[PDB]
Amino acid sequence: DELGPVNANPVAACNEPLCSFDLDQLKLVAVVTGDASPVAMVEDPAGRGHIVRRNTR
Amino acid sequence: HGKWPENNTSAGVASSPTDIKGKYVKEVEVKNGVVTATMLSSGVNNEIKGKKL
Amino acid sequence: FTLIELMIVIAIVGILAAVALPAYQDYTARAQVSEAILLAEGQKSAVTEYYLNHGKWPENNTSAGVASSPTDIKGKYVKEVEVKNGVVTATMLSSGVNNEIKGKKLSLWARRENGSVKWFCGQPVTRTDDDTVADAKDGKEIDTKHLPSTCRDNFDAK
Amino acid sequence: HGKWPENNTSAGVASSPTDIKGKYVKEVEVKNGVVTATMLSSGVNNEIKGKKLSLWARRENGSVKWFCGQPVTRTDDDTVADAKDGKEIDTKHLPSTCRDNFDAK
Amino acid sequence: FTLIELMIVIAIVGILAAVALPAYQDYTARAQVSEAILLAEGQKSAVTEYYLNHGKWPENNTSAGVASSPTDIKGKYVKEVEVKNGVVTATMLSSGVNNEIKGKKLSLWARRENGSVKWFCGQPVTRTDDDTVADAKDGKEIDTKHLPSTCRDNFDAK
Amino acid sequence: YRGKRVSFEFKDIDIQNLLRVIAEISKKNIVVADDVSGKVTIRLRNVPWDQALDLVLRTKALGKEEFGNIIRIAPDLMVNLLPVNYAVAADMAARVKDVLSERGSVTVDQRTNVLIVKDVRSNTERARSLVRSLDTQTPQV
Amino acid sequence: YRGKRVSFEFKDIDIQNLLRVIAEISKKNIVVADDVSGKVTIRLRNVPWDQALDLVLRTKALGKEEFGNIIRIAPDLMVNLLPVNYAVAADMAARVKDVLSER
Amino acid sequence: YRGKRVSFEFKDIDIQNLLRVIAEISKKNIVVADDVSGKVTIRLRNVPWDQALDLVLRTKALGKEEFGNIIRIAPDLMVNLLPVNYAVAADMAARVKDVLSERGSVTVDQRTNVLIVKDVRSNTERARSLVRSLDTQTPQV
Numbered sequence A: 001d002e003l004g005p006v007n008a009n010p011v012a013a014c015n016e017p018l019c020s021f022d023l024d025q026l027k028l029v030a031v032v033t034g035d036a037s038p039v040a041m042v043e044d045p046a047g048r049g050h051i052v053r054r055n056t057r
Numbered sequence B: 001h002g003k004w005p006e007n008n009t010s011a012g013v014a015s016s017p018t019d020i021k022g023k024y025v026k027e028v029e030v031k032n033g034v035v036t037a038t039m040l041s042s043g044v045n046n047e048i049k050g051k052k053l
Numbered sequence C, E: 001f002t003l004i005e006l007m008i009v010i011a012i013v014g015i016l017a018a019v020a021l022p023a024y025q026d027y028t029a030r031a032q033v034s035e036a037i038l039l040a041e042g043q044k045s046a047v048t049e050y051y052l053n054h055g056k057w058p059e060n061n062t063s064a065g066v067a068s069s070p071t072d073i074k075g076k077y078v079k080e081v082e083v084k085n086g087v088v089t090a091t092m093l094s095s096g097v098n099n100e101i102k103g104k105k106l107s108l109w110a111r112r113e114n115g116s117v118k119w120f121c122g123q124p125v126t127r128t129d130d131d132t133v134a135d136a137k138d139g140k141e142i143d144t145k146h147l148p149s150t151c152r153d154n155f156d157a158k
Numbered sequence D: 001h002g003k004w005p006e007n008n009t010s011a012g013v014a015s016s017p018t019d020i021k022g023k024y025v026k027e028v029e030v031k032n033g034v035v036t037a038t039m040l041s042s043g044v045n046n047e048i049k050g051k052k053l054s055l056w057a058r059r060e061n062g063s064v065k066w067f068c069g070q071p072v073t074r075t076d077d078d079t080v081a082d083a084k085d086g087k088e089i090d091t092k093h094l095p096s097t098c099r100d101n102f103d104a105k
Numbered sequence F, H: 001y002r003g004k005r006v007s008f009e010f011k012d013i014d015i016q017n018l019l020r021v022i023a024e025i026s027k028k029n030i031v032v033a034d035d036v037s038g039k040v041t042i043r044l045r046n047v048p049w050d051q052a053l054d055l056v057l058r059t060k061a062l063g064k065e066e067f068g069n070i071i072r073i074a075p076d077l078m079v080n081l082l083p084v085n086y087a088v089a090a091d092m093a094a095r096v097k098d099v100l101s102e103r104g105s106v107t108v109d110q111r112t113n114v115l116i117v118k119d120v121r122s123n124t125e126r127a128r129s130l131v132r133s134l135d136t137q138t139p140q141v
Numbered sequence G: 001y002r003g004k005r006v007s008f009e010f011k012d013i014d015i016q017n018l019l020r021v022i023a024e025i026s027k028k029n030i031v032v033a034d035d036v037s038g039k040v041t042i043r044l045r046n047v048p049w050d051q052a053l054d055l056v057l058r059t060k061a062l063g064k065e066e067f068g069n070i071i072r073i074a075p076d077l078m079v080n081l082l083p084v085n086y087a088v089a090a091d092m093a094a095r096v097k098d099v100l101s102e103r
Helices: C005-040 C044-054 E005-040 E044-054 F015-024 F049-059 F089-100 F121-137 G015-024 G049-059 G089-100 H015-024 H049-059 H089-100 H121-137
Strands: A027-032 A039-043 A049-053 B025-031 B034-039 C078-084 C087-092 C105-112 C117-122 C125-129 C132-135 D025-031 D034-039 D052-059 D064-069 D072-076 D079-082 E078-084 E087-092 E105-112 E117-122 E125-129 E132-135 F009-014 F029-032 F039-044 F063-066 F070-074 F077-083 F106-110 F114-120 G009-014 G029-032 G039-044 G063-066 G070-074 H009-014 H029-032 H039-044 H063-066 H070-074 H077-083 H106-110 H114-120
Touching: A027 F015, A039 F009, A039 F015, A049 F015, C005 C078, C005 C087, C005 C105, C005 D064, C005 E005, C044 C105, C044 C117, C087 C125, C105 C125, D034 D072, D052 D072, E005 E078, E005 E087, E005 E105, E044 E105, E044 E117, E078 G089, E087 E125, E105 E125, E125 F089, E132 F089, F009 F015, F015 F029, F015 F039, F015 F049, F039 F049, F039 H063, F049 F063, F049 F077, F049 F106, F049 F114, F063 G039, F077 F121, F089 F106, F089 F114, F089 F121, F114 F121, F121 H089, F121 H106, G009 G015, G015 G029, G015 G039, G015 G049, G039 G049, G049 G063, H009 H015, H015 H029, H015 H039, H015 H049, H039 H049, H049 H063, H049 H077, H049 H106, H049 H114, H077 H121, H089 H106, H089 H114, H089 H121, H114 H121
Parallel strands: F029 F070, F039 F077, G029 G070, H029 H070, H039 H077
Antiparallel strands: A027 A039, A027 F009, A039 A049, B025 B034, C078 C087, C087 C105, C105 C117, C125 C132, D025 D034, D034 D052, D052 D064, D072 D079, E078 E087, E087 E105, E105 E117, E125 E132, F009 F039, F063 F070, F077 F114, F106 F114, G009 G039, G063 G070, H009 H039, H063 H070, H077 H114, H106 H114
């Protein structure tokens, strides 16, 4: 009666990664700089890459 | 030449289709590189005469 | 009651030969003409040199500096090769050839490029002036079907 | 060569007609391009022994076409004729594919 | 009941032509390229002399002292031959050739040996300076498979 | 294809990260497809980004298509700028193309007659030695 | 094929938009088919439009056919004008064609 | 592809050990696959490691891919640095390539116009004799 019509499973959840891991675990991969302001690139102990810049956390 | 022979003469064969006949073959015509063979009307099966490939 | 495998297979090889007959008969003629062409060529050298050195086409074989006798430039299917004002014509013998190509011939002629010449190959032609030839229309030309793709030149090819 | 083989040796086959025999075939001779087959005398019907047929061809010009029928003789390079003599295999014994007449084209 | 000898032998010659098709088709193309090469050469003379006499590569055909018109140095499979700063490029016609080589070309270029020059033959190249050329990378180069063993030279061959 | 000058240092990072980073620096808004490629290493100095990008593409990475506001990208080495004071950059093109062969590495010609190379250090070194060597016969005016 | 001089700057825009924009500037009334292509990027300075158009065609875009009043079009980079003060432009054509290759 | 200078001496050791050893010296964090190869012998002097690595790859060993922080590697001879004082290193490349043929051995061109060779001593000796011999006609200025 509800599957024959239209189905969405909305996002509201957790997903917020580096604020769940300690700072000395993170490793600086690279840095980018240009007109869009300077941005750092950093690696998780889980091996993900992230991009963060001045004023971010 | 890079172009298909328009007819028998172009292909350099019996300029006359009927000149390429046989016992069951009434002829063989070259039409733009395509060579078609016609089945005679005498001396053949019954459901294949006047028929071709 | 029985024996039809021997009778049909002897009669399919018989009809196979009849179908393979015209294929071998133009492949064959087309082969005998390809030589009249080779015998015609290699005489381009003499003719070319004669023209470039003198500015006039060699009138005959002797002028071109080749077997003074046309019949001395014959072959298996070639009854001869004559140079007539720079034009070199090759005649097909009467024995050892197809059937619709014997006694038939082709021509090789050249044109002043100015400092050099360019050669043509095709059906018999006659030379008019030092830079113009024309169909030796007479009925003894080797049929287009027997001529290579490289020897389909017309009297006015440039 | 443009000429029909005069005999077996010319055609490049068992120089001896009798060398081209069989069970019912006493031989096969090539006479000016015409190939005739003779029926033995032992091991055959009764009204066909010692009887024969011929295969001959015709210049198509660049190729040839073959015929099969009752005995024939070659006249000129492009003409043969009934070897009328009485030893021809009777029409009733010949296949539908071997009913050719001396002047078939 | 019988007739399979005629049917198979007509179908083996049919498949024989299909197997003989690609062999004659690259032998053929490889033959049409061997000429683009002959038309390109013989123009080395003009270019060599021009260079040795002046110390500068001929800018174009007229400079090299050859048919001022590229199109005047054409052939059966060759649509032309242009001299561009000593580099001589030959273009394949569009009619009368293979299929994957038409409108395609190669180049002949030389290098100062000091007192003489050495010639190279290969895929299209452009001249940069008096002693350096480079791949005329663009997509119209005659495929390596169609080039003789004597015409496999790279832009930096010495 | 014009930007502020930058130095790109990427030690084993997702090209998607390099891309985002490149959007966070106002080098357009860049967006990939989802699964473009993987991870790459490059290290550039003194290169405008829009070039360090063209150059990133050639490494491993993608080609770029721009909508206008956003750009879609779909599926050490170093960069060094060579000034050419004396010669024209295009005259080098024959010789420089001839070192590359079927290698990796590239050369980019900027409008102000400077060459830019990405490659391994060993192919950069070769390209610099040739560019400077040919520049050097051009300074004797 | 003659017009006022212009500078075309298009950052990731539908060729249909560039076209309309080009009609809104009195460069004919331009109309496409429906689905011509998509989006393109170009950036020109000092180019008459009717040229910046011919040049837009070659980028990605279409060919143009004119009815007379209306034109139908059917299915950074930059432009710069080079003055040639001394030589004839046609003498460059051999060398300039030779850089382009299949580019 | 830049590092401290080192001397690599490996007498019949697992390339996995040479690798780890190379990570324990801050030459990245290196990690192989599991079964890369086996054991190798090399002996280098005065070579930066990132080179002695490229050179180790060519011996028997693997190719390297870097994630950035970690690098993955997947499936005597000596090294000597030749200074080239007088000539450009790239001018040697034609002749040096011509000794190698289909042999083992390699030549690496560093940016500061020095050649580096790994090989057997006998191929090193040949390459040095040619590099010095061609350098020697270049010192007569």
